[PDB]
Design a protein around this ligand. Structure first.
Ligand SMILES: Nc1ncnc2c1ncn2[C@@H]1O[C@H](COP(=O)(O)OP(=O)(O)OP(=O)(O)O)[C@@H](O)[C@H]1O
Lengths: 112, 634, 461, 56, 222
DNA sequence: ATCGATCGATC
DNA sequence: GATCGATCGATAAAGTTTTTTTT
């Protein structure tokens, strides 16, 4: 069964409200912060990328493969939505944080 | 050995003493003619090849190349008596071989084919330029005799040694610079053209090494087929696969010819003869001094289609062309004629354009959807891994007389049509997209296959209401051929009883008896057969230039002025300064077919009465009133 | 003799006491060769546990076995194993700890290196799974009603519709293609469609033909974006742009392709296949040189009506749901009608249950599948020519026919012109090509005239 | 800070602050050696130089 | 196989490496383990189970007994529970020698009220079948399903991995989002609905490979 | 700059 | 004729922002 409900906000002040949310996220335990640029929805889960001359094809990731059972505080919901909008459902959809690339088909947990 | 010395005597007899087809010394005539142009080439007739292989099939398919080296030195003496001291210029000749009775594709090569004659087709991809090749390795020692004679270097093997006939030390071999001539070298690599191939699969690669007097005959992109030998070079080094007991492939060539068309022949139209030496040029004058030739040629041009006359007047006039008359330091003059057809969906308009593709010398058939807005003209293909952004043109730079089908590809009509109507207006157009500012020169011709939105009379109103093509691009053409067919009986049978008989048209003597069968199958009513009529268009276009007079001019002055006046108050589509330029242009097109260089009086009113009627006959219900003006021109 | 995996230098036992191992010269004269190729294999689909990067290996084909291995099929092999290293030679200078076993393999008698050993595979022989019978044709050609025997023995999954059963059999065979000299190559086939209400007996023939016909592909023709029906080259990949592509026209070279659902394509391909219909070649110049490819095809179609139910009092000029000149470019149809009667549903119910029995094979087609299949392979080896003077009988029929469909000078542009006269004889020879008669009688073209005419009065109200 | 440590600070002792990035793993380095001949058993010793060396 | 939770009972070793590829020079080592034993974390059909189910097969209410067993927490809703076990009892391949080639597999669907264990029922069906699929939110696509060209990090060559519809050879295709699926795809499932196959038109090769498949659809309102 | 191979000289 | 020493020759390098059609 599902636990760990998710509350969302909306509204357009001129206060730049990230200080009203994410200041809590910068003192809360296991609360990692993200933005629009950088970690996309494919960059939210784990992936295989380039590395230095040492052991390549390591499983680099974003937030949800490392912020399990914590706080995932996000901003800019209309940014990089072609990969984001599916994957944010996949934590509310129970336990399907996975890397279904050509490399492997293993699935890790989802509790955030 | 020594009996091959007699072989040269045994074939110079067997070749030069007699040429077939009632003598005439055919091969004994084409030798001196290519001596006159100073172009270093010869041919061999296949029927002569059929007769000069009886003792030589075991000296062609057994040993192809050293037979040719002793075959080369007899051709000097075959013309040294004819042209004395011809060896003092360029000192060299080598033969070429004509067609062969094999149909090998690229896939079908095995071990049994090597070190023998081969024939294969394909297409030319990425190619290099022209380098010089050393060809005569004057070897050089350091302390002993440093001139070991000019050698005979091979293909990619680097034939050298460490020490021989001077010492046995490790003294390397060097060069010097006295009297080493150079032949050139041009490594076109070949890709299999996707024609006769079981589809849905990949292309396959080869390599072709050209030779001295066969450089840059091909152009990149164009379809070719090559006849040469097969060779091997076991270099013992390859670095895509591992090193293995394998060996590469090199195809050296002896000849090369252009794309061929309608591959169904048995003894002709595969070899580009196009060599109007004696039996043609002595004949071709009396066929030009007759009185109804222009009433005979255009009737007998496209034999398969009976139809209305005026299109065959126009489409024969299109590939005959005019003149690119240059001028002093001022604006140039268009030397092209660009027809445009308009037809009902079901008349023969798709066939005359198909048939004229064969009867031209070079062509292209970019039709319908999929014609890119840039791929017609030149485009830049990006570099490979260590190269530069080079210029690889497509259709229009290759085709000098090209054929497109711009009917109504409406989704891409707003893409490409900004790139074809400046091939005419600002003729010789080229572009500088992210590359080099250059200007290629392409004096191309354009025909078209327009198609209205449904029936031919989709409105009573003018042609801006009929076609979706707007005014100014449409005005870059000269004439609008339009068809009509409502209801008839005796004109209907004149097609109907005609086309039914066309479907009824479905060993040395017997090779020619089949060739004699080829005469009567196109000579039912005998309309001047196409065995030779295409064979003189190629020098009807590159040998004769016409001129005009001045006393036969000012009749046309009121023709342009009054008809423009008669069509502005009644405005369907206008005429400008360029219509009268097309008036005199197609006038001298007809006079080029008299092989005459002049302009008569009979050709002007002929050329007038093919434009004035073909303009007015698409107006309105009120075409009947305009025809009351029409015979004032006549 | 016996050049090994790296022995590019035979340097053993000269005849006299000359300089052994000093040089070599690979003679291209006496050293006989053999021809080979190196391909990769892959594991079959019904054995993978999951998408777990299905590994592979490589083979070598040595003898005549070259080119027998058509790529992309289930296949078997001989089975000799081998291991091949290649690291040190005369020419070019020879992640993780792969080749860790190689450090054991050092210190041979020549120079100290790190020679590996990688597993490979060699084959010798390939296979690819997936009389009186010649006298049986001579007996079966001496029958009488085989034109009527064949039409009853087409498909057990259909009942009735004896008009359209006649047409598909003529499509199943081929016509003629030889034509006039020095110019036009005429039509080579017929092309017939049937429109009707979906989820009916239209879909059964489409199931029937694609196994019954030689190499005939089926494609829905809905992917009108990338490639396939529309022909369009691929982007620059691994060494070049402007490469040819597949699609269900090029591999239908003497193959009978079948596409459906004409309504849902775009407005651009409706001239593209219209180009592909009139003659037998297509042309392309998209960002590369012109291509001269000739897809010798014969299409089969089944579109959808404008509302799913066909009106009766009108013509199909409204209900064709496309433009005008492709229909005139097409042949005629014999549209399948529909009705709800008390009797036909009951007999079709009995017709379907014994079929949908696991085993009720009491229905008897008077031929089998394969003896019909080899029969038309005997039928294609003739060339019947009209020789009688019924062409004078022929021309008056069309001359009467053209004055019917033109109901006025301002009547519609579905005027059946001289384009259809070719089909008016090239079906007329093919029906006589079914009954193995090498010439054309005026009696045989009786079924030829009305076959358009009973279906053009379906057009003309 | 690292912006001004360019000069005479070679072969000396300097503390620098900063931010640690690109942490590698723990790997065994070599400080002594012992080759075995399997005849005499005298395991030969040598010192270790920089990151590449050669046996005897 | 690659991609599972694992435990190993390994010894320890270390190897030298050559710095230059063509000399005997060597010094920062690389370690690796050597495993002695590893651990992750046609069935053998007995006869007591066949005897046990025949007691259940003696019970006439097996339809009702399988009606109540499929829901450990779900509200009753008898009508949806009919076809789900029926599709799981997915017929057989009643195939003739000549003609036909029909298969008894059918296709149910459902749509309607949002989040009525629409996914958890599909998760529950994923429990009851060992070899099946699971759809994703754009995990597969039109070109991302099959027909691959992909430049893999081991050899940079071609690999043809099967799509999920071919991958269910012995299962039930569970698939969703059939109102937000792109119209570049939702065009090849008609072929596996009809000819039970996937036709591949890729630069590699052509293949008419079949797909023994069975589908259900979980749509959504708008 | 170092290592390996080949050639020459000496025993 | 074989072995040892000296001299000469050959062997090690690295990539990933602009621009094209296309969907
Ligand atoms: N006047 C004619 N004489 C002989 N044959 C004809 C004539 N008109 C049509 N045909 C025949 O009709 C066939 C159909 O081709 P047709 O020329 O009608 O295409 P089209 O309607 O011109 O095509 P498009 O409109 O796309 O150019 C041709 O193969 C041709 O042989």
């Amino acid at each position: 069964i599902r636990g760990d409900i998710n509350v969302c906000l909306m509204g357009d002040p001129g206060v730049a409200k990230s200080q009203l949310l994410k200041a809590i996220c910068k003192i809360s335990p296991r609360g990692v912060y993200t933005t629009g640029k950088g970690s996309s929805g494919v960059g939210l889960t784990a992936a295989v990328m380039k590395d230095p001359v040492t052991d390549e094809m390591i499983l680099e990731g974003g937030a949800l493969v490392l912020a399990d059972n914590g706080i995932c505080c996000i901003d800019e919901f209309d940014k990089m939505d072609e990969s984001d909008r599916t994957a944010i459902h996949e934590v509310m959809e129970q336990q399907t944080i996975s890397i279904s690339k050509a490399g492997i088909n293993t699935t890790l947990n989802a509790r955030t | 050995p020594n009996v091959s010395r007699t072989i040269a005597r045994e074939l110079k007899s067997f070749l030069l003493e007699y040429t077939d087809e009632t003598g005439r010394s055919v091969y004994g005539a084409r030798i001196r003619t290519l001596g006159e142009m100073n172009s270093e080439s010869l041919e061999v007739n296949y029927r002569h090849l059929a007769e000069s292989k009886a003792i030589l099939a075991l000296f062609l398919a057994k040993c192809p190349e050293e037979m040719l080296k002793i075959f080369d030195l007899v051709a000097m003496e075959a013309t040294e008596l004819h042209y004395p001291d011809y060896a003092r210029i360029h000192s060299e000749i080598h033969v070429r071989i004509s067609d062969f009775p094999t149909i090998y594709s690229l896939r079908e090569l095995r071990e049994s084919n090597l070190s023998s004659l081969v024939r294969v087709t394909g297409v030319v991809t990425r190619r290099t330029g022209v380098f010089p090749q050393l060809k005569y390795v004057k070897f050089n020692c350091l302390k002993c005799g440093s001139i070991l004679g000019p050698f005979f270097q091979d293909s990619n093997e680097e034939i050298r040694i460490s020490f021989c006939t001077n010492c046995k030390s490790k003294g390397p071999f060097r060069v010097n610079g006295e009297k080493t001539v150079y032949r050139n070298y041009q490594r076109v690599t070949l890709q299999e053209a996707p024609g006769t191939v079981p589809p849905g699969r990949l292309p396959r690669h080869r390599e072709v090494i050209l030779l001295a007097d066969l450089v840059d005959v091909s152009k990149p992109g164009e379809e070719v087929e090559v006849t040469g030998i097969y060779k091997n070079n076991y270099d013992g080094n390859l670095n895509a696969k591992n090193g293995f007991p394998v060996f590469a492939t090199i195809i050296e060539a002896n000849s090369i010819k252009r794309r061929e068309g309608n591959t169904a022949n048995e003894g002709e139209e595969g070899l580009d003869v196009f060599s109007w030496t004696e039996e043609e040029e002595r004949e071709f004058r009396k066929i030009s001094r007759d009185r109804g030739i222009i009433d005979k040629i255009i009737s007998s041009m496209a034999p398969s289609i009976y139809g209305h006359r005026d299109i065959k007047t126009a489409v024969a006039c299109s590939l005959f062309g005019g003149v690119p008359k240059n001028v002093n330091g001022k604006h140039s003059i268009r030397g092209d004629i660009n027809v445009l057809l308009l037809g009902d969906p079901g008349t023969a308009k798709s066939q005359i354009l198909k048939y004229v593709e064969k009867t031209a010398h070079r062509a292209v058939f970019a039709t319908g959807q999929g014609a890119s807005a840039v791929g017609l003209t030149a485009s830049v293909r990006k570099d490979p891994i260590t190269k530069e952004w080079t210029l690889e043109g497509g259709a229009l730079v290759l085709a000098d007389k090209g054929v497109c089908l711009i009917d109504e590809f409406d989704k891409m009509n707003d893409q490409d049509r900004t790139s074809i109507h400046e091939a005419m207006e600002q003729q010789s157009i080229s572009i500088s997209k992210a590359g080099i500012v250059t200007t290629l020169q392409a004096r191309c011709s354009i025909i078209a296959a327009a198609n209205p939105n449904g029936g031919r009379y989709n409105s009573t109103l003018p042609l801006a209401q009929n076609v979706s093509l707007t005014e100014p691009i449409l005005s870059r053409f000269d004439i609008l051929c339009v068809v009509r067919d409502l209801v008839d009986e005796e004109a209907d049978e004149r097609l109907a009883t005609f086309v039914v008989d066309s479907h009824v048209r479905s060993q040395l003597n017997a090779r020619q008896r089949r060739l004699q069968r080829q005469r009567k199958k196109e000579e039912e009513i005998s309309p001047i057969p196409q065995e030779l009529l295409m064979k003189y268009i190629h020098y009807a276009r590159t040998k004769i230039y016409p001129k005009l007079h001045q006393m036969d001019m000012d009749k046309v002055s009121r023709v342009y002025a009054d008809l423009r006046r008669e069509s502005i108050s009644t405005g369907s589509f206008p005429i400008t300064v360029r219509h009268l330029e097309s008036i005199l242009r197609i006038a001298e097109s007809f006079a080029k077919m008299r092989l005459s260089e002049f302009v008569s009086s009979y050709d002007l009113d002929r050329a007038i009465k093919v434009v004035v009627d073909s303009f007015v006959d698409a107006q309105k219900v009120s075409v009947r009133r305009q025809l009351r003006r029409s015979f004032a021109i006549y | 003799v016996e050049q090994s995996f790296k022995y590019t230098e035979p340097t053993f036992c000269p005849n006299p006491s000359c300089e052994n191992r000093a040089f070599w010269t690979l003679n291209v004269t006496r050293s006989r060769f053999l021809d080979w190729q190196k391909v990769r294999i892959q594991e079959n689909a019904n054995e993978i546990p999951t998408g777990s990067m299905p590994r592979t290996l490589d083979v070598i084909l040595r003898g005549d076995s070259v080119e027998r291995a058509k790529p992309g099929d289930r296949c078997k092999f001989t089975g000799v194993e081998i291991v091949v290293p290649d690291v040190t030679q005369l020419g070019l200078p020879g992640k993780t700890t792969e080749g860790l076993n190689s450090g054991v393999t050092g210190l041979r008698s020549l120079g100290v290196r790190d020679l590996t050993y990688k597993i490979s595979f060699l084959a010798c022989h390939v296979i690819s799974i997936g009389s009186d019978e010649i006298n049986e044709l001579k007996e079966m050609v001496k029958d009488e009603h085989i034109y009527d025997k064949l039409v009853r023995s087409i498909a057990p999954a259909v009942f009735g519709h004896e008009a359209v059963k006649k047409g598909i059999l003529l499509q199943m065979l081929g016509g003629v293609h030889k034509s006039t000299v020095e110019g036009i190559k005429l039509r080579g086939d017929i092309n017939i469609c049937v429109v009707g209400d979906p989820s009916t007996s239209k879909s059964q023939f489409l199931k029937y033909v694609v196994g019954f016909a030689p190499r005939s592909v089926y494609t829905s023709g809905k992917a009108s974006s990338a490639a396939g029906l529309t022909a369009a080259v691929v982007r620059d990949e691994e060494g070049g742009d402007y490469t040819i592509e597949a699609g269900a026209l090029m591999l239908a070279d003497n193959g009978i392709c079948c596409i459906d659902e004409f309504d849902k394509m775009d407005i651009s391909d409706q001239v593209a296949i219209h180009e592909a219909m009139e003659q037998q070649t297509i042309s392309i110049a998209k960002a590369g040189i012109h291509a001269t490819l000739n897809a010798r095809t014969s299409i089969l179609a089944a579109a959808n009506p404008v509302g799913g139910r066909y009106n009766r009092k009108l013509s199909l000029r409204g209900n064709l749901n496309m433009t005008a000149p492709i229909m005139s470019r097409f042949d005629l149809f014999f549209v399948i009608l529909d009705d709800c009667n008390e009797k036909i549903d009951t007999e079709l119910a009995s017709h379907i249950v014994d079929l949908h029995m696991k085993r009720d094979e009491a229905i008897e087609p008077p031929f089998s599948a394969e003896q019909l299949r080899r029969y038309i392979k005997y039928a294609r080896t003739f060339k019947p020519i009209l020789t009688k003077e019924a062409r004078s009988y022929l021309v008056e029929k069309y001359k009467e026919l053209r004055k019917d469909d033109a109901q006025g000078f301002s009547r519609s542009s579905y005027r059946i012109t001289v384009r259809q006269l070719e089909s008016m004889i090239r079906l007329s020879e093919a029906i006589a090509r079914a009954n193995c008669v090498d010439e054309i009688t005026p009696s045989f073209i009786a079924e030829a005239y009305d076959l358009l005419r009973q279906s053009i009065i379906r057009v003309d109200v | 800070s690292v912006r001004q440590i360019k000069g005479d600070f070679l072969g000396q002792l300097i503390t620098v602050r900063g931010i640690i990035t690109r942490v590698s793993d723990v790997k065994p380095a070599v400080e002594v050696i012992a080759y075995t001949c399997d005849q005499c058993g005298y395991e030969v010793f040598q010192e270790v130089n920089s990151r590449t060396f050669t046996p005897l | 196989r690659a991609g599972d939770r694992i435990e190993v009972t390994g010894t320890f070793r270390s190897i030298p490496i050559r710095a230059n590829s063509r000399q005997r020079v060597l010094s920062l080592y690389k370690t690796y383990v050597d495993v002695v034993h590893v651990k992750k974390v046609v069935r053998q059909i007995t006869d007591q189970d066949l005897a046990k189910i025949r007691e259940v097969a003696a019970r006439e209410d097996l339809y009702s007994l399988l009606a109540r067993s499929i829901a450990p927490s779900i509200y009753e809703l008898e009508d949806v529970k009919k076809g789900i076990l029926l599709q799981l009892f997915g017929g057989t391949n009643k195939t003739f020698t000549k003609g036909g080639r029909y298969r008894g597999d059918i296709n149910i669907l459902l749509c309607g009220d949002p989040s009525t264990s629409k996914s958890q029922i599909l998760q529950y069906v994923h429990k009851i079948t060992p070899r099946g699929v699971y759809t994703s939110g754009k995990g597969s696509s039109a070109v991302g399903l099959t027909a691959y060209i992909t430049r893999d990090v081991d050899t940079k060559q071609l690999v043809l991995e099967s799509g999920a519809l071919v991958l269910s050879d012995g299962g039930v295709c569970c698939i969703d989002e059939f109102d937000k699926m792109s119209d570049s795809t939702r065009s090849v499932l008609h072929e596996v609905m009809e000819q039970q196959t996937i036709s591949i038109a890729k630069a590699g090769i052509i293949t008419t490979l079949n797909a023994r498949s069975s589908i259900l659809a979980s749509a959504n309102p708008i």
